[PDB]
Amino acid sequence: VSNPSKPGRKTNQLQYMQNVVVKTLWKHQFAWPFYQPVDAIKLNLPDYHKIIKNPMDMGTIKKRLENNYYWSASECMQDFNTMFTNCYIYNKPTDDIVLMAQALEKIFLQKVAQMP
Amino acid sequence: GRKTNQLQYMQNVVVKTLWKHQFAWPFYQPVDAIKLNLPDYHKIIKNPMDMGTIKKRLENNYYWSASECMQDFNTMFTNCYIYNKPTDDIVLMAQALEKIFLQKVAQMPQEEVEL
Amino acid sequence: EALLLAKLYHF
C-alpha cells in the first residue's frame, strides 16, 4: 500500500457546529444583521475598523465550515465569540442590534451545551 | 383639521394594528437619506412620508378627512416601491403592511362624520 | 436605530 489516504472529514464537534449550531442560528429571526461582514462605508459607520480590528460574521463562519477552513470546533466557537463581542463593543448597550446579538448568543451557548 | 369617526378608526385601529406588525419598523420615522447613505433618495422621492408622521398627524388633528390619511399611506407605500427594487426585503415588508392596511380599511365606517 | 435601518444600525 503506497498511499493509505482517506477522505477528509470533520470531527463530530465540527459537524455539530455546522449542522446544528449554525443552522439553528441562521434560521433565527434576529440573525440577519450577522449574515455578512459589516460594510462600514456603505453603512456609514464612524471608526468601525479603528475599534473593531478582527471583524467576523456568520457568513464567514458558514463558509469556513463549508470550505473546511476549520480543523477544530474550538476555532469555530472562537469566531462566534469574536462576532458577538465586536457587536457588544462597538454599539451602544441599548441598541437593538446588541439585544439581537445577545439573543443569538444565548441560543449559541444553549446549543454548545447540547454538544458531545 | 377635524376629528371624525373615520380618522378615529385610522388612529385607533389602522395605525394601532400596523405599528405592532413585525415588519413595520422601517416605516416608523422619515428616511434620513444622509444618515442611511442614500444620496439619490430625494432626487427620486419628491414627497416623503412615513407612518410616524401619519401617527403624529392623527394625534394633532392635522387631517380634515380620512381620505387624506389614506393618501399619506399610499404615498409611503408607493415611495418604497419606487425607490427600491421589487425584490428588496423592504418592498416585501411594505407589501405585507399594505395587505393589512387594505383589510382594515375595508371595515372602516363608510360615512365620515365629524366628532 | 439607524444601523439596523442602514435603518437598524441608525436606530
Author numbering:
A (entry chain B): 26 to 141
B (entry chain A): 33 to 147
C (entry chain C): 2 to 12
What do the authors say?
Bromodomains (BDs) regulate gene expression by recognizing protein motifs containing acetyllysine. BDs are small alpha-helical bundles found in ∼40 human proteins that mainly regulate gene expression. These domains harbor a deep pocket that specifically recognizes AcK-containing peptide motifs in both histones and other gene regulatory proteins such as transcription factors. To begin to address this knowledge gap in an unbiased manner, we carried out mRNA display screens against a BD—the N-terminal BD of BRD3—using peptide libraries that contained either one or two acetyllysine residues.
Because of the limited solubility of the original peptides, we synthesized analogs that incorporated two glutamates at both the N- and C-termini of each peptide to improve solubility and facilitate further characterization of the peptide–BD interactions. We also determined the X-ray crystal structure of BRD3–BD1 bound to 1AcK. Again, the electron density for the peptide is best modeled at 50% occupancy in the two symmetrical orientations. Furthermore, the binding pocket of one BD accommodates the AcK8 residue, whereas the other binds Tyr10 (6A inset, and S10B). Instead, the most highly selected sequences from the 1AcK screen retain five of the key binding residues (Leu7, Leu8, Leu11, Tyr12, and His13) in the same relative positions but “shift” the AcK in the C-terminal direction by one helical turn. Strikingly, 4.2A also displays two of the three leucines in the same positions (Leu7 and Leu11), with the aliphatic portion of an AcK side chain occupying the third position to pack against the WPF shelf. The direct mode of Tyr interaction with Asn116 we report here, albeit through a water-mediated hydrogen bond, has not been described before. Again, it is noteworthy that this mode of interaction with Asn116 is mirrored by the AcK in the 1AcK peptide here and also the AcK in the 4.2A cyclic peptide from (11)—raising the possibility that such interactions might occur in vivo, though most likely with lower affinity.
